[PDB]
């Protein structure tokens, strides 16, 4: 069925699974026209497809040309997402195909179920977790590859860098969701925290800085403080 806090360790078991988030597929800027009406301009987007056990991220870049001449784009975006996830599954060897795909938004269930009818044994599930994957475009190297794309493209990343050499996938997922929640709540301050110390750098082959174990504890504390600080600013607490 649906995925929640009761069955949370299921994410880190040995059954291959993917999260799919479609919140950055169809992206627009809204502006005034010369006549004073309002129009949208699409910008490149991405599908965020993540294995939470291994950290492997299949980032399908959605180039603005896919919307040309199409109507009802917010509806089309869900079906394009499901089309691309289905194509990804079919591209993987059988032993790498997921046994479950967890969508972060319930509106993706029917499009994905329909595109995956050929795979009756892959479960398509919603979740009651509120996951901050929309903030993926706050990760500088991911935003850069999306914005520079001139055509459709798939780029593979490990969203955990090398963390699994030192921590479990449960802890790595918790660190990722804390970082992304902080970037979603106050992007400027979160990036300040992550980069304030110029002696800690991001390796060329990594997304996040090369913090020691003790430095990650400090960073994580500062991110929790940031989230709490913004919560107090929001609700006047």
């Amino acid at each position: 069925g649906a995925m929640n806090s009761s069955n949370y360790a299921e994410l880190f078991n040995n059954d291959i699974k993917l999260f799919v988030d479609d919140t950055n597929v169809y992206r627009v800027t809204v502006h005034k026209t010369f006549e004073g009406n309002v129009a949208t301009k699409a910008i490149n987007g991405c599908i965020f497809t993540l294995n939470p056990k291994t950290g492997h991220l299949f980032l399908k870049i959605i180039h603005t040309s896919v919307w040309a001449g199409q109507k009802r784009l917010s509806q089309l975006a869900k079906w394009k997402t499901a089309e691309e996830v289905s194509a990804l599954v079919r591209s993987l060897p059988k032993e790498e195909q997921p046994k479950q795909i967890i969508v972060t938004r319930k509106a993706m269930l029917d499009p994905l179920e329909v595109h995956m009818l050929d795979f009756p044994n892959i479960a398509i599930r919603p979740t009651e977790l509120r996951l901050p994957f929309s903030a993926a475009m706050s990760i500088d190297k991911l935003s850069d590859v999306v914005m520079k794309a001139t055509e459709p493209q798939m780029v593979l990343f490990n969203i955990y860098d090398d963390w699994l050499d030192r921590i479990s996938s449960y802890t790595a997922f918790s660190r990722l969701t804390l970082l992304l929640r902080a970037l979603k709540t106050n992007e400027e301050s979160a990036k300040m925290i992550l980069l304030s110390d110029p002696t800690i750098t991001i390796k060329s082959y990594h997304l996040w800085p090369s913090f020691t174990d003790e430095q990650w504890i400090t960073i994580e504390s500062q991110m929790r403080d940031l989230i709490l600080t913004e919560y107090g600013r929001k609700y006047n607490v």
Binding site: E83, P111, L117, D118
Partner: protein, 300 residues
């Protein structure tokens, strides 16, 4: 006019004949139903006074044989049987009519209700949904499941309606996923009409039979089938104009006949609101929308 005699009525029972019904007391001198209109299928149905569990009954057409009802004290139900001795049968009926031991099928001359509910229903198609080839009539009851229900358990006692499933490979062409899911015209026109049913008359016959089994027996799988066959049409952007006009008439008479007090269990809110107010055909069912809004405005 044809006649279905009863050997006797040993147990108290409410007897239905098409949309009519009457009560028979235990051991009352009741010997059947006369003046049954030729030209239509009919259903004779039962609900025992001491155990309303299991409504059951029989679909038949008097042009196909001479049929009678006899209670079976072992199996505990009124059974339909065929009499092959025509002279015996005529003699039995004449005696019971002379003694005025039969109810008359009470059709008002002005009243086309039964024709309107059975216009496309044919005994030959009934006998393919309800499989018991040794009889010319077909038994249905409240509890019988459909083939589709069994997939999701005795196959000999099932209702073999045509399986309709909107999230199935039959309904969705590889490469046209969004198109076929949001506009079911392919599935309606190519898969179902051209492929399975052959013509719209056979499709409407099955739809009408599903409705009638839902209404007369409280058969849940029949109700599911009726709504699925409506939704498939309403969710198609391309439907022949003659089919939409006929559907409106079919549904109008079904909604008109439904007991007001059964509307809560026989009508699916989601399907009807979708069909009348959101679907491609939301403006094509004028007669049905008007009777629905005036008779069951709560459901909407």
């Amino acid at each position: 006019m044809n006649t279905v005699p009863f050997t006797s009525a040993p147990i108290e029972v409410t007897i239905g004949i098409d949309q009519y019904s009457f009560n028979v007391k235990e051991n009352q001198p009741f010997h059947g139903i006369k003046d049954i209109p030729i030209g239509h299928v009919h259903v004779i149905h039962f609900q025992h006074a001491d155990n309303s569990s299991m409504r059951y009954g029989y679909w038949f057409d008097c042009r196909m044989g001479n049929f009678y009802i006899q209670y079976d004290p072992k199996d505990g139900l009124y059974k339909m049987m065929e009499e092959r001795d025509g002279a015996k049968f005529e003699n039995i009926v004449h005696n019971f009519k002379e003694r005025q031991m039969m109810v008359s099928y009470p059709k008002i001359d002005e009243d086309d209700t039964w024709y309107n509910l059975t216009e496309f229903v044919q005994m030959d198609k009934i006998r393919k949904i309800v499989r018991k080839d040794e009889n010319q009539f077909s038994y249905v009851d409240s509890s019988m499941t459909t083939v589709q229900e069994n997939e999701l358990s005795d196959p000999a006692h099932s209702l073999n309606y045509t399986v309709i499933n909107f999230k199935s490979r039959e309904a969705i062409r590889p490469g046209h996923e969004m198109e076929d899911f949001l506009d079911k015209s392919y599935y309606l026109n190519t898969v179902m009409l051209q492929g399975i049913f052959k013509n719209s008359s056979n499709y409407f016959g099955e739809l009408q039979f599903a409705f009638l089994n839902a209404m007369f027996f409280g058969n849940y799988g029949s109700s599911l089938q009726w709504h699925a066959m409506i939704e498939l049409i309403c969710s198609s952007a391309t439907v022949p104009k003659h089919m939409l006009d006929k559907l409106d008439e079919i549904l109008y008479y079904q909604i008109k006949t439904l007991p007001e007090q059964y509307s809560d269990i026989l009508l699916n809110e989601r399907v009807w609101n979708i069909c009348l107010y959101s679907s491609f055909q939301k403006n094509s069912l004028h007669n049905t929308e008007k009777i629905m809004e005036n008779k069951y405005p709560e459901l909407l």
